[PDB]
Amino acid sequence: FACKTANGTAIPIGGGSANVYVNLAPVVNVGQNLVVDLSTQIFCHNDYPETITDYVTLQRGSAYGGVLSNFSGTVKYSGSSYPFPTTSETPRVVYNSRTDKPWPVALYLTPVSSAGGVAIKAGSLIAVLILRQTNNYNSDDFQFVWNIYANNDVVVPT
Numbered sequence: 001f002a003c004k005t006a007n008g009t010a011i012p013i014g015g016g017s018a019n020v021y022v023n024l025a026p027v028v029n030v031g032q033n034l035v036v037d038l039s040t041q042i043f044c045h046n047d048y049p050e051t052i053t054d055y056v057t058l059q060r061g062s063a064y065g066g067v068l069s070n071f072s073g074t075v076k077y078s079g080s081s082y083p084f085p086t087t088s089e090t091p092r093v094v095y096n097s098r099t100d101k102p103w104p105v106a107l108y109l110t111p112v113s114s115a116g117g118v119a120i121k122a123g124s125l126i127a128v129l130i131l132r133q134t135n136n137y138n139s140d141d142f143q144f145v146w147n148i149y150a151n152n153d154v155v156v157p158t
């Protein structure tokens with residue numbers, strides 16, 4: 001089991017960490033959602049599907065900078081919604097193919113009432129998402145740490 005980003009940055013067998021740079025909607029009004037869809041950015045595969053079934057969870061999701069300060073978040077994992085920053089590990093997603101399959105994570109961030117102006121700064125850390133991978137074969141338990149960075153400023157109109 002290993003993962004890679006849309007630009008080819010990889011995390012090999014045994015886990016580790018990688019930076020993900022995301023393009024964000026430039027304008028988000030109060031009452032609207034800023035969608036950070038990581039399913040188009042993070043892809044994983046099973047290296048031995050003939051014998052092993054891999055299990056993948058979103059172990060934890062943390063918010064930073066402008067996202068922590070100016071937004072109220074929700075994380076959608078494989079069709080279900082949870083608070084963001086996260087309060088529990090999600091259920092498991094099965095990886096049973098060598099074909100690169102998306103990690104089904106998407107953040108839904110709506111501005112808090114105090115938000116106005118530049119709510120997210122270009123180049124800043126916005127989130128840390130921990131992918132936890134286990135299997136039905138041995139005691140392998142690995143963390144794939146995704147550091148999410150904003151590629152651009154996000155303005156909340158006033």
Ligand SMILES: CCCCCCCO[C@H]1O[C@H](CO)[C@@H](O)C[C@@H]1O
Pocket residue numbers: 001002013014045046047048049052053054134135137140
């Ligand atoms: C002859 C037996 C060969 C055993 C090969 C072990 C491969 O382990 C990796 O791939 C697995 C499947 O994706 C992951 O559950 C854990 C490791 O990432």
